[PDB]
Amino acid sequence: QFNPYGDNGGTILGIAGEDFAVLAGDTRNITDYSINSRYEPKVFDCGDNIVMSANGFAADGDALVKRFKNSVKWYHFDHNDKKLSINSAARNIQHLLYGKRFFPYYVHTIIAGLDEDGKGAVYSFDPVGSYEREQCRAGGAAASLIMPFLDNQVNFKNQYEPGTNGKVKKPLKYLSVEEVIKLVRDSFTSATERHIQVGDGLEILIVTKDGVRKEFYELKRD
Amino acid sequence: SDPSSINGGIVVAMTGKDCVAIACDLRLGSQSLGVSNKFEKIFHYGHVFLGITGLATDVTTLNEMFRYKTNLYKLKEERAIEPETFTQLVSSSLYERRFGPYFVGPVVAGINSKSGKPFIAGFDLIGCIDEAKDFIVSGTASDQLFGMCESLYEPNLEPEDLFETISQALLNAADRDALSGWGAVVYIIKKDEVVKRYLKMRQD
Amino acid sequence: MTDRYSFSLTTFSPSGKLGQIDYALTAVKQGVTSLGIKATNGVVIATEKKSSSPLAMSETLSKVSLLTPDIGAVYSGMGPDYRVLVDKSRKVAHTSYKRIYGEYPPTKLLVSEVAKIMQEATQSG
Amino acid sequence: TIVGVKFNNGVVIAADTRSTQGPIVADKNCAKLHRISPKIWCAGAGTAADTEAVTQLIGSNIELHSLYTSREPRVVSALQMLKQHLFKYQGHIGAYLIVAGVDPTGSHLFSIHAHGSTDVGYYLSLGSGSLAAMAVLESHWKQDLTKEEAIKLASDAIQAGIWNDLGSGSNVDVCVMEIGKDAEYLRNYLTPNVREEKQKSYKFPRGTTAVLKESIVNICDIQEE
Amino acid sequence: TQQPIVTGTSVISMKYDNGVIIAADNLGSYGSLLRFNGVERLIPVGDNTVVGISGDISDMQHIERLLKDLVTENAYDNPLADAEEALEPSYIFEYLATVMYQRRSKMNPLWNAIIVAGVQSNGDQFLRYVNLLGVTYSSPTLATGFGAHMANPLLRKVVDRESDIPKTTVQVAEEAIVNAMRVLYYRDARSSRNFSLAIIDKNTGLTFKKNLQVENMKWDFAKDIKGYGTQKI
Amino acid sequence: XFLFX
Amino acid sequence: XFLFX
Amino acid sequence: XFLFX
Amino acid sequence: XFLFX
Amino acid sequence: TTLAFRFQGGIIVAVDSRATAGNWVASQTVKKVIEINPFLLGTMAGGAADCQFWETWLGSQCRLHELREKERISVAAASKILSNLVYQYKGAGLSMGTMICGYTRKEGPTIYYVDSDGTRLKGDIFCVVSGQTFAYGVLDSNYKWDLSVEDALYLGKRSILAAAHRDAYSGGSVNLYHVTEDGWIYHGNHDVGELFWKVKEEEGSFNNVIG
Amino acid sequence: MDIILGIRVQDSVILASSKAVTRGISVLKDSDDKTRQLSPHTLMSFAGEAGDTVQFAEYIQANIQLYSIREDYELSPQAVSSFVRQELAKSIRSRRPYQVNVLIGGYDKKKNKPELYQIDYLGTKVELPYGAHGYSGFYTFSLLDHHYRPDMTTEEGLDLLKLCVQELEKRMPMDFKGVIVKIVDKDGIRQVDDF
Amino acid sequence: MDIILGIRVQDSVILASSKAVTRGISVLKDSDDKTRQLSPHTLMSFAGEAGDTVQFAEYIQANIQLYSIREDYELSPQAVSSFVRQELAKSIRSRRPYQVNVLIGGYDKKKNKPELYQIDYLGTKVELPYGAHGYSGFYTFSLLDHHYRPDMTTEEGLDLLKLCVQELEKRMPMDFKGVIVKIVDKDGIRQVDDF
Amino acid sequence: SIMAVTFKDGVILGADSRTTTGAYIANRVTDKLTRVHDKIWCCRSGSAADTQAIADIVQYHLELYTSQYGTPSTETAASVFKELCYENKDNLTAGIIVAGYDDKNKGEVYTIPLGGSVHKLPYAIAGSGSTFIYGYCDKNFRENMSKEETVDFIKHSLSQAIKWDGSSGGVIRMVVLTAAGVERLIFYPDEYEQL
Amino acid sequence: SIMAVTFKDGVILGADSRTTTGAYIANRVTDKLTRVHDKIWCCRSGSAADTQAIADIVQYHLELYTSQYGTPSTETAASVFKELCYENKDNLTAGIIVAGYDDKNKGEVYTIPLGGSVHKLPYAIAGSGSTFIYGYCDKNFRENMSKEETVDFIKHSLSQAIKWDGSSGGVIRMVVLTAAGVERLIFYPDEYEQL
Ligand SMILES: [Cl-]
Ligand SMILES: [Cl-]
Ligand SMILES: [Mg+2]
Ligand SMILES: [Mg+2]
């Protein structure tokens, strides 16, 4: 029979800072054991300081990102050029995803930006539009490799204050953009080693009050 | 239905400077239901340590089988079996059940008594050998353990440092797996002393 | 047909002697001299190549045999009996050890296996 | 990715060093080049346990045959014994091997598939990266290759697999078997995929982990007195 | 939902310093039967774009008609149809990509893999892929079917990254494509010796080469191969 | 699972 | 995949 | 797959 | 069934 | 694990916070209680998306009712809006196990269990443990009508802990709500990891553990 | 599985219905009333697929209540039963049939006679002295065949129903958590508390 | 489905086992004893597939009784449990595996300690303070995690078991027709009549 | 594409050189003409593994036959092939043409389809590519052709088979079997494509 | 077995006369050459029902075309066939060869396989029997043959197709399309079998 779905692999990672947010993804596109592209961008500027990535089936991911970009355009038209807040974007994307509830978009969606208080925000969606706001989220093939690392290194999980013997947890702290980028690079370097679908390149989009800037780092090509 | 994820559980092994570490969770379940939090998955035959994940009936059966085989070895050879030799015995034993295999993911850890060289190895269920320098992972949260080990690990860690690394690798991997946790044990192994530590971790 | 000799051909005599083993040792006594000496840094085994005919190429007849890369064997007595024992000894080194432990057996355990094959020819039907 | 290339005075086999569990890389430096006999080596693809088990079994029986016959083993012997074993198990032993070697007969290069089919060639490739490798071999192979040229072609064909196949990766292992010479096994002949320094040391401060209990393990036997 | 009947195999392509090259064999297969030996699978659109199509030939002939109809429609009430408002490679691709994804989403796909090669108004090289699922991606080298497995590895040794495109001449690029077509003829059981090749250069425009043949083949070594192991005769 | 070039 | 207490 | 004129 | 050269 | 029970002091609502995709723990920070309006709560079990979407939609339909009728919607009416909606989608593969909990002058404290099967039941206590829905608590021994609000909060909290420990797919943290006359009150999020050890030490229970 | 029994005595109809709502291995409730009042002298008990049961009963209840208001008259049980059967007979050949089995107990004021109707989800209707749906029906039929009489009083009817439930509890493998009993006579519909 | 529970208190082991034998929708018996005395101080309760349960228990009983006669010694519960586990561990890879889940309650006279062992049809064995098999498992497990203590007396153990059965009757959808309770201590094995 | 043709001076075997896995050409220089005796050869079609295994056993059987009874007949060789193919028909995918030269019987061709049936024929064609040249071969075959005529007939025949069949390709291998001895011929694409 | 061959003076359509249900010949004198216009004819292969339904619609479309725009081109006829075959590919089993004579374009042949693809060819073969004459037809076809040469080429071709194909048989029907007009030829077994 004809199968309407495919797997294009890749991995996306969203980390929220105090006054910034990052959305990173590998630039590798694959089909089975074949590499389709070593540089196919997966993380997009959608306007109004919102970055979006739909990872899984590339065709569904491209379609969803288009519909949301279109959704932002018509928000401006119908609401006197009002800036679309990240919470409003998140709710809109849920309705996009749930629209195809009985023919789902086979994608893991993460969006990053600043909230209305100017604090960094990351939202994570399932294929059928269930969403939740988080500090940390990894999506895609190597999500299972990266998320435990982020739990340990971003939220300081299973880490206690030395000399307490597990009596006092390590204090939660906001990471600097420079510290967050190191974790993103180390996460993807580690994921590239142990996952066949992850590698080639890493593109990071950093969101601040000043706007959206882009950093690119090479990954192993095997 | 899938035999290797009915009972659940994990094992991880690491090498350091003149030492090895092997650690496991303590959970045994019937799928969603947790039954026991005292099911240790690490056994030792002399100075050679064996961790086994997978179907719990096979974990127990293989422990009894390797105790049997290493006892007869010692009586005939008049010396304890070494990690390198035991690795070959595990592989041999698993591949003789090639078309009716034990649903297990074994891990060997120990220091060669003569050379003093730290040694770890992993196996698939039909007895293929993975002899890594750095670390070996096994069980229902292998993906999670690969992620933790690959980032946390650096070579030539001192025994007390290696302990922190392997502990944080197991604990954070187990918390992202439904069928792993309910306590954890860590063995720090030096040439002629072995310390065994139970870890405090969330019980959900 | 069928091997209808299911019974021992080596039994105890009233004096407590196993005749066939004594007679086997008598055959060994008639055999050409072989020796072994152990040094600190090695071992030597030696024997005479008693050529049956000068037309015979004595190089083709090996009295000293490799069993494993680190184990050699020499004999005194019946040559054919030795040749089939070397074949069985080489095989048992693989089947009962190397195919299990991935290394060649130590000297004493291969000896133990050869010893077992010879004991069975002393009791089996 | 495993290749074999025939040259003027011998045969060369190469392989990658990656083994996989589904989409996860289990071993970054696997050894896919197996010694059947001192001057007969073969590269294996497919079920990792099956390739080791099948080469060790035939390698053992070849050694006993060599001792029995007082002759150096022949590649055709290893080839015949492998195919009859694999055929018996009707492909259920998933061993895909490239068998090469030098013997008193000369230099030989064979491939053997899991169902017990063998074939002869001057250049062969097996595994998931075979198409990437065969593309390079079909482009650069000629008759009367030198040793240096055959090593270059073999390793280039593996690299093709490493870069372009997700099943292949890490380093290139080579084994050169030249007539009237000792076979030279070049473990990690190339290291094209060396991991870069991490941004951060993840070494934890001592006492970070919460410990319930501690105890000494007795690994020593029952003591005297 | 259907099954492909009459099918075309690999389409292969790459970028070079001044433009793009694309190639495909002239065969329409009917399963194992090599039924049609005169099938053109490179379809030019204006003087700046070539669309290479693999998969179902009935669906290819439909797409051929859509593109022919697209040129007609663009000319309607368009004084600059042969100038500033001519069809761009990017326009032609996005249209096909839209159709391919719509058809898959109605569970009635156009059973094809498509590569759009061309040069844009500003002289930028265009090369993008789309298939029956509506999956799209761009790379310095692109190939469909067997081409992906055998052609890409060879073409990627010439252009491995973006920085290699300015250093790659049209002579080197064409040489690589022609060699790749030979390798595909050796190794693809659904390929033919006869193929078409199209170059789209920003300076010299569109050059379309028909009735090309795979030549300089190596077969002589076959005579020295006897049996499958032990046979000597 | 098994290990599988 | 989707999430599912 | 299995090799097969 | 159905009639079918 | 979702728990809603009725007592003299009103309604206690206790849920866990774990979301799973097979054996993968996707999140430990999921809000399984939905605040439809100041007097209406909805628990969520089954498909995360199905529950989130339709219980959010219910809040819209409940808001329109107030604007049109100038009165607060009854729990019976609100529950039946959701139950009549899911019944239209019956057999389409919606996965939903929810309790609609509120107080109104007309009805008093009311809990309605609404199912993706189109089952709508009124009861004093409803529990969803693993994939099974029960008209009894996870423990049920401690349950007496005349119970202190802060005592009743503990039973709800304790009941989620009991399930969270044994069930692989229950865990994260316990979210507590108290529904009364003049609205519901949030009683905070309690991490099960910290909660377990504290409860063990204080209660002297979970002896089969060790720590 | 769900127990619904009906017995028509001399001057009334008695409906016994299990109080347990179970889904798979889970008991959802132990006080469920599987009955709707269609009219002042007509009662319908229902068992079957979750959701369908209540949705069907309430839909029938609304239609019979509409008829009552419009004509200021009560439809006879024969007429109500025929309407219900026809709605079920429509549903079997619909896209998703109602999987509901019903008992209709009514008192006809014109004829001064009690009437019991058994209708299955296919729209199979019979008038019976006693009826039942599911596993319970076979045991209860054999027992009622022996004991039942046409001239039995309401009290005699309740004792025989009491015996049926007792014997069903012993014999049945599932726990149906007791029954709710309702009587339909000339005075209307009332619930028997003691059972 | 069948309820078998085990609780190990300070100085004894108590086994509660459902008395109902049901096949599909039929109740075959309401007084079934799902227990065999392996030795004077070892008791085994069993639940699972019809025939296999009794056949397995009686086979184990015969082997342990043979050991007792031959050595004029009682095997320790640890030793009996290991034997039983190994017999089940053989059977999973046999032509037709025994589909039997067992609880082994024993008093070790050498150590003067009660021991409870839970073994499933695969040969999965654990020593527990309390154990259970089937649906009844998760509930009782979580109810004893709250109430159970290691230093509980036999009488305290029975009251907690009494609470478990009561709560199981309310919560469980099937009728298991009560339980038989047996105590294993230093004096031997006795059946508690009042329950 | 495989064929064996009897002519005046003996028999000629012809075959293509392509081995496939799906649509990938695993070997483009395959030798499908194999020796079972000095002047008894066979053409292999179907499974590569099966045909190699069969051919290897038949070579063994004829080597042992020769040791005891001298040179075997082509009929004898065909019979040994048939015996293996018929008795193992359930587990084998092998289409074999047996061709041999005696001095008494001269050139003989036997074809063994899947069933394991034997057919003695003046000439024979087999394999996927054979279907396209049934018409051509039937129209162009004559008995008692010359060597040059027979080489042309095979070259033209397989040339067409290769052209239309995706599963056939590479070089055309031939083996000539006469009193003179055994001659190997090869024809490359540039030669046979332009025919 | 169906074929259309372009020669100097026009085009000739050829076909066998056999219709089958399984292995039973339902019709042994079938006319598979059908008129869609005075000098546009088609050869029908595949489903008898489908090809008849398609041919009937195309004849309707060209009759209406002629009324409005005069005599349609062979290309136009092929296009209408393609449109029906492509747009209804999921529900149709039809392999059609379209052959026609213009005065401007002379003889033209279009083949439409299952997909609904169109291929303009100097000559075309289709049907189950065609597979056996691919080799023969490719070797024997020349462009700009005479009428007598083209009749011989078709007679010999279908003679071989009929001989090897069980699904082909009966008489060889032919239709000659030239400026001169329309000629029907028939060739009986006794004639074409001895070729
Ligand atoms: Cl072959
Ligand atoms: Cl017809
Ligand atoms: Mg866990
Ligand atoms: Mg015929």
Q: For L82-169, where are the E strands, in sequence order?
A: 100-108, 113-119, 125-127, 130-133
* H helix intervals, chain J: 48-69, 75-88, 149-166, 192-203
Distance from CA of D205 to the nearest CA of A (A): 7
The phi and psi torsions of J42 (rounded to 5 degrees) equal -130, 120
As a residue count, chain L comes to 195
Given a contact cutoff of 8 angstroms between Cβ atoms, the answer to whether B108 and B121 are in contact is: yes
Q: How far apart are alpha carbons A155 and B199 in whole angstroms?
A: 20
CA distances from residue A11 to A21, A175, A183, B32, D193 in whole angstroms, order as listed: 17, 22, 15, 29, 20
Where would I find the beta strands (DSSP E) of D8-153? 10-16, 19-21, 24-27, 33-37, 40-46, 95-103, 106-112, 118-120, 123-126
Q: And the tokens for C113? A: 């296996």
Question: N157 vs M135: CB contact, 8 Å cut-off?
Answer: yes
Closest Cα in chain D, distance from residue M192 (Å): 22
L190-194: long-range contacts at Cβ-Cβ below 8 A with a sequence spacing of 24 or more?
L192/L14, L192/L158
Q: Which residues of D110-145 are buried (b: 16+ CB within 10 A; e: fewer)?
A: bbbbbbbbbbbbbbbbbbbbbbbbbbbbbbbbeeeb
Q: Using a threshold of 3 CB pairs under 8 A, tell whether chains B and I touch.
A: no
SS3 category, B130: strand
- Please, what are the domains in chain K? 1-195 (3.60.20.10)
Element housing B162 (H / E):
helix B159-174
Residues of A in contact with B175 (CB under 8 A): 148, 151, 157-158
N156, N3 in Cβ contact below 8 A?
no
Resolution in angstroms for this experimental structure? 2.9
Work out the burial of residue B7: count CB atoms within 10 Å of its CB; fewer than 13 is exposed, 13-18 middle, 19 or more buried. Answer: buried
The domain A1-222 is classified under which CATH number: 3.40.50.300, 3.60.20.10, 3.40.640.10, 3.20.20.120?
A: 3.60.20.10
SS3 call for K44: strand
Question: Is the four-CA dihedral C85, C90, C93, C94 of positive or negative sign?
Answer: negative
Q: What angle do CA B175, B178, B181 make, to 5 degrees?
A: 50
- Cβ of J115 under 8 Å from any chain G Cβ? no
Distance A122 CA to ligand 3 centre (A): 25
Check CB contact under 8 Å for M131 and N133. Answer: no
Q: Confirm if B107 and B22 have CB atoms less than 8 A apart.
A: yes
Distance from CA of B39 to the nearest CA of L (A): 8
Tally the domains of chain B: 1
Q: Residues 2-31, chain M: which have Cβ within 8 Å of H?
A: 2, 15-16, 18-21, 26-27
Ligand nearest to the CA of M53: 1
Question: J48: annotated binding-site residue?
Answer: yes
- Residue D126, amino acid: L
- Asked if L26 lies within 8 A of K170 by C-beta distance, the reply is no
**Chain J environment of B6 (Cβ under 8 Å):** none
**Chain-chain contact of L145 with J139 (C-beta, under 8 angstroms):** no
For J72-123, the DSSP string reads PPPHHHHHHHHHHHHHHTTTS---EEEEEEEEETTTEEEEEEEETTS-EEE-
Inter-chain touch F5–D21, beta carbons under 8 Å: no
State the distance from the centre of ligand 2 to the C-alpha of N71, rounded, in angstroms.
26
**Ligand 4 geometric centre to CA of N51 (Å):** 22
Query: Residues A15, A138: contact at Cβ < 8 Å?
Result: no
Is residue E204 annotated as a catalytic residue, yes or no? no
What's at L32, amino acid-wise? D
The structural domains of chain E, ordered by start, are 1-233 (3.60.20.10)
Q: Which tokens sit at C28?
A: 């060994």
Domain of residue B57, residue span: 1-204
Tokens of L64: 């342990």
Separation of alpha carbons M189 and J14, rounded Å: 79
Instruction: Show the CA angle centred on residue M66, arms to residues M64 and M68, nearest 5°.
Output: 75
Q: Around Cβ K49, how many Cβ atoms within 10 Å?
A: 18
Beta bridge partners of K29: K21
CA distance D34 to D36: 6
Experimental approach taken: X-ray
Q: Where are the domains of chain A?
A: 1-222
Chains D and A touch (3+ CB pairs under 8 A): yes
Q: Give Cα separations from M65 to E48, M36, M68, M71, M77 (angstroms).
A: 73, 12, 5, 8, 10
Q: Give the C-alpha separation, D132 to D192, whole Å.
A: 17
- Closest by CA to K34, choosing from K61, K3, K73, K64, is K3
Name which of M156, M177, M129, M133 is nearest M18 in CA terms. M129
- For K118, list phi and psi in degrees, rounded to 5: -105, 120
Going by the DSSP 8-state scheme, the letter that residue J167 receives in this structure is: B
Q: Are K150 and K3 within 8 A, CB to CB? A: no
Go through E128-149 and write b for each residue having 16 or more CB atoms within 10 A of its CB, e for each that does not: bbbbbbbbbbbbbbbbbbbbbb
Residues of chain D found within 8 Å of residue F4, distances taken between Cβ atoms: 19-20, 46-48, 167
Output the CA N164–ligand 4 centroid distance in Å. Answer: 6
Report the SS3 class of residue B103: coil
What is the DSSP secondary-structure string of chain M? -EEEEE-SSEEEEEE---EEETTEEEESS---EEEEETTEEEEEEE-HHHHHHHHHHHHHHHHHHHHHH-SPPHHHHHHHHHHHHHHTTTT--EEEEEEEE-SSS-EEEEEE-TT---EEESEEEESGGGGGGHHHHHHH--TT--HHHHHHHHHHHHHHHHHHBTT--S-EEEEEEETTEEEEEEE-HHHHTT-
For residue J37, the cross-strand partners are J40
Buried b (16+ CB within 10 A) or exposed e, B180-202: bbbbbbbbbbeeeebbbbbbbbb
Q: Which helix (H) or strand (E) holds E137?
A: strand E136-138
Kind and range of the H or E run holding D185: strand D184-190
Contacts of E32 in chain N (CB under 8 A): none
What token pair was written down for M168? Answer: 């056939």
* Residues contacting residue L35 through CB under 8 Å, at least 6 positions apart: L15, L17, L43, L44, L45, L46, L180, L182
